[PDB]
Design a protein around this ligand. Structure first.
Ligand SMILES: CCCCCCCC/C=C\CCCCCCCC(=O)O[C@@H](COC(=O)CCCCCCCCCCCCCCC)COP(=O)([O-])OCC[N+](C)(C)C
Ligand SMILES: CCCCCCCC/C=C\CCCCCCCC(=O)O[C@@H](COC(=O)CCCCCCCCCCCCCCC)COP(=O)([O-])OCC[N+](C)(C)C
Lengths: 48, 48
Protein backbone atom coordinates (compact mmCIF):
# COMPACT_ATOMS: atom_id res chain seq x y z
CA UNK A 1 0.00 0.00 0.00
CA UNK A 2 3.04 2.28 0.39
CA UNK A 3 4.30 4.06 -2.69
CA UNK A 4 7.39 6.26 -3.11
CA UNK A 5 6.69 9.94 -3.63
CA UNK A 6 10.06 11.66 -4.08
CA UNK A 7 12.10 10.95 -7.20
CA UNK A 8 14.92 10.11 -4.76
CA UNK A 9 12.90 6.99 -3.92
CA UNK A 10 11.23 6.35 -7.29
CA UNK A 11 14.45 4.97 -8.82
CA UNK A 12 14.81 2.65 -5.82
CA UNK A 13 11.19 1.73 -6.45
CA UNK A 14 11.90 1.53 -10.16
CA UNK A 15 15.01 -0.63 -10.23
CA UNK A 16 13.70 -3.00 -7.55
CA UNK A 17 10.58 -3.57 -9.63
CA UNK A 18 12.78 -4.37 -12.62
CA UNK A 19 14.93 -6.61 -10.44
CA UNK A 20 11.97 -8.62 -9.16
CA UNK A 21 10.52 -8.73 -12.66
CA UNK A 22 13.52 -10.66 -13.98
CA UNK A 23 13.87 -12.90 -10.89
CA UNK A 24 10.28 -14.14 -11.09
CA UNK A 25 10.37 -14.40 -14.89
CA UNK A 26 13.59 -16.42 -14.81
CA UNK A 27 12.07 -18.51 -12.03
CA UNK A 28 8.91 -19.42 -13.97
CA UNK A 29 10.77 -20.04 -17.23
CA UNK A 30 13.22 -22.45 -15.59
CA UNK A 31 10.68 -24.27 -13.39
CA UNK A 32 8.89 -25.56 -16.49
CA UNK A 33 11.99 -27.68 -17.11
CA UNK A 34 12.22 -29.03 -13.56
CA UNK A 35 8.60 -30.09 -13.12
CA UNK A 36 8.57 -31.74 -16.56
CA UNK A 37 11.13 -34.24 -15.29
CA UNK A 38 12.99 -35.99 -18.10
CA UNK A 39 12.71 -39.64 -17.15
CA UNK A 40 15.30 -42.32 -16.46
CA UNK A 41 17.47 -42.73 -19.55
CA UNK A 42 20.04 -45.51 -18.86
CA UNK A 43 22.31 -45.19 -21.90
CA UNK A 44 21.45 -48.50 -23.59
CA UNK A 45 18.36 -48.53 -25.79
CA UNK A 46 18.90 -51.24 -28.42
CA UNK A 47 21.48 -53.73 -29.66
CA UNK A 48 23.04 -51.03 -31.84
CA UNK B 1 55.44 -50.44 -57.35
CA UNK B 2 56.43 -48.38 -60.40
CA UNK B 3 54.34 -50.31 -62.90
CA UNK B 4 52.49 -53.32 -61.57
CA UNK B 5 50.00 -55.89 -62.86
CA UNK B 6 47.98 -55.38 -59.66
CA UNK B 7 47.05 -51.68 -59.84
CA UNK B 8 44.25 -51.98 -62.40
CA UNK B 9 42.96 -55.18 -60.81
CA UNK B 10 42.46 -53.26 -57.55
CA UNK B 11 41.31 -50.08 -59.35
CA UNK B 12 38.31 -51.97 -60.71
CA UNK B 13 37.99 -53.82 -57.37
CA UNK B 14 37.70 -50.67 -55.23
CA UNK B 15 34.98 -49.34 -57.55
CA UNK B 16 33.00 -52.55 -57.00
CA UNK B 17 33.05 -52.16 -53.22
CA UNK B 18 31.67 -48.61 -53.11
CA UNK B 19 29.03 -49.57 -55.67
CA UNK B 20 27.95 -52.39 -53.36
CA UNK B 21 28.41 -49.99 -50.45
CA UNK B 22 30.91 -52.11 -48.51
CA UNK B 23 33.37 -49.21 -48.35
CA UNK B 24 30.58 -47.34 -46.59
CA UNK B 25 29.69 -50.38 -44.47
CA UNK B 26 33.29 -50.71 -43.29
CA UNK B 27 33.35 -46.93 -42.78
CA UNK B 28 30.44 -47.11 -40.34
CA UNK B 29 31.92 -50.22 -38.73
CA UNK B 30 35.10 -48.61 -37.37
CA UNK B 31 34.66 -44.82 -37.26
CA UNK B 32 31.30 -45.13 -35.52
CA UNK B 33 32.03 -45.45 -31.82
CA UNK B 34 30.27 -44.00 -28.82
CA UNK B 35 27.86 -41.21 -29.73
CA UNK B 36 29.89 -38.59 -27.75
CA UNK B 37 26.84 -37.15 -25.84
CA UNK B 38 26.17 -33.79 -27.33
CA UNK B 39 26.09 -30.20 -26.12
CA UNK B 40 22.28 -30.35 -26.31
CA UNK B 41 22.11 -32.68 -23.30
CA UNK B 42 21.23 -30.04 -20.70
CA UNK B 43 18.72 -32.03 -18.56
CA UNK B 44 19.00 -29.53 -15.66
CA UNK B 45 19.92 -25.86 -15.35
CA UNK B 46 19.82 -24.27 -11.91
CA UNK B 47 20.24 -20.56 -12.55
CA UNK B 48 23.44 -19.26 -11.02
C1 LIG C 1 27.62 -0.23 -3.96
C2 LIG C 1 27.17 -1.66 -4.33
C3 LIG C 1 28.05 -2.73 -3.66
C4 LIG C 1 29.51 -2.70 -4.17
C5 LIG C 1 29.73 -3.61 -5.41
C6 LIG C 1 30.16 -2.80 -6.67
C7 LIG C 1 28.94 -2.40 -7.54
C8 LIG C 1 29.26 -1.23 -8.51
C9 LIG C 1 28.24 -1.13 -9.67
C10 LIG C 1 28.65 -0.82 -10.92
C11 LIG C 1 30.15 -0.56 -11.21
C12 LIG C 1 30.75 -1.59 -12.22
C13 LIG C 1 30.39 -3.06 -11.86
C14 LIG C 1 31.24 -4.11 -12.63
C15 LIG C 1 31.46 -3.74 -14.12
C16 LIG C 1 30.20 -3.98 -15.00
C17 LIG C 1 29.75 -2.69 -15.73
C18 LIG C 1 30.34 -2.61 -17.16
O1 LIG C 1 31.42 -3.04 -17.38
O2 LIG C 1 29.60 -2.01 -18.22
C19 LIG C 1 28.32 -2.56 -18.42
C20 LIG C 1 27.33 -1.42 -18.68
O3 LIG C 1 26.07 -1.81 -18.16
C21 LIG C 1 25.29 -0.74 -17.70
O4 LIG C 1 25.28 0.29 -18.29
C22 LIG C 1 24.44 -0.91 -16.43
C23 LIG C 1 23.69 0.39 -16.03
C24 LIG C 1 22.32 0.53 -16.73
C25 LIG C 1 21.72 1.95 -16.56
C26 LIG C 1 20.86 2.07 -15.28
C27 LIG C 1 19.96 3.33 -15.29
C28 LIG C 1 18.62 3.10 -14.55
C29 LIG C 1 17.71 4.36 -14.58
C30 LIG C 1 16.21 4.00 -14.81
C31 LIG C 1 15.36 4.09 -13.52
C32 LIG C 1 13.87 4.41 -13.83
C33 LIG C 1 13.07 4.84 -12.58
C34 LIG C 1 11.55 4.82 -12.83
C35 LIG C 1 10.82 6.03 -12.20
C36 LIG C 1 10.88 7.28 -13.09
C37 LIG C 1 28.32 -3.52 -19.61
O5 LIG C 1 29.61 -4.10 -19.76
P1 LIG C 1 29.85 -5.64 -19.17
O6 LIG C 1 29.34 -6.65 -20.17
O7 LIG C 1 29.11 -5.79 -17.86
O8 LIG C 1 31.47 -5.90 -18.92
C38 LIG C 1 31.92 -7.24 -19.02
C39 LIG C 1 33.31 -7.27 -19.74
N1 LIG C 1 33.24 -7.79 -21.15
C40 LIG C 1 32.53 -6.75 -21.95
C41 LIG C 1 34.51 -8.06 -21.87
C42 LIG C 1 32.49 -9.06 -21.18
C1 LIG D 1 10.19 -5.84 -20.26
C2 LIG D 1 10.22 -4.30 -20.15
C3 LIG D 1 11.48 -3.79 -19.40
C4 LIG D 1 12.05 -2.50 -20.03
C5 LIG D 1 13.50 -2.23 -19.59
C6 LIG D 1 14.43 -1.86 -20.77
C7 LIG D 1 15.84 -1.42 -20.29
C8 LIG D 1 16.82 -1.14 -21.47
C9 LIG D 1 16.92 -2.34 -22.44
C10 LIG D 1 17.99 -2.52 -23.24
C11 LIG D 1 19.18 -1.53 -23.24
C12 LIG D 1 20.48 -2.19 -23.78
C13 LIG D 1 20.22 -3.15 -24.98
C14 LIG D 1 21.48 -3.97 -25.38
C15 LIG D 1 21.59 -5.31 -24.60
C16 LIG D 1 22.10 -6.47 -25.49
C17 LIG D 1 23.00 -7.47 -24.72
C18 LIG D 1 24.42 -6.89 -24.46
O1 LIG D 1 24.84 -6.04 -25.16
O2 LIG D 1 25.20 -7.39 -23.39
C19 LIG D 1 26.58 -7.35 -23.63
C20 LIG D 1 27.23 -6.32 -22.70
O3 LIG D 1 26.19 -5.57 -22.10
C21 LIG D 1 25.92 -4.34 -22.72
O4 LIG D 1 26.68 -3.88 -23.51
C22 LIG D 1 24.62 -3.59 -22.38
C23 LIG D 1 24.84 -2.58 -21.22
C24 LIG D 1 23.50 -2.06 -20.65
C25 LIG D 1 22.75 -3.17 -19.88
C26 LIG D 1 21.67 -2.59 -18.94
C27 LIG D 1 20.33 -2.32 -19.68
C28 LIG D 1 19.14 -2.22 -18.69
C29 LIG D 1 18.90 -0.76 -18.21
C30 LIG D 1 18.71 -0.68 -16.67
C31 LIG D 1 17.38 0.02 -16.29
C32 LIG D 1 16.25 -0.99 -15.98
C33 LIG D 1 14.88 -0.55 -16.55
C34 LIG D 1 14.60 0.96 -16.36
C35 LIG D 1 13.27 1.20 -15.62
C36 LIG D 1 13.35 0.72 -14.16
C37 LIG D 1 27.19 -8.74 -23.39
O5 LIG D 1 27.94 -9.06 -24.55
P1 LIG D 1 27.12 -9.74 -25.82
O6 LIG D 1 25.73 -10.14 -25.38
O7 LIG D 1 27.86 -10.96 -26.32
O8 LIG D 1 27.01 -8.61 -27.05
C38 LIG D 1 25.89 -8.66 -27.93
C39 LIG D 1 25.47 -7.19 -28.25
N1 LIG D 1 24.22 -7.15 -29.07
C40 LIG D 1 23.11 -8.08 -28.75
C41 LIG D 1 23.68 -5.78 -28.94
C42 LIG D 1 24.62 -7.43 -30.46
Amino acid sequence: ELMPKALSTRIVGGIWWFFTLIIISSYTANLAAFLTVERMESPIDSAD
Amino acid sequence: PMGSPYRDKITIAILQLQEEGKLHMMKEKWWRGNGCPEEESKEASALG
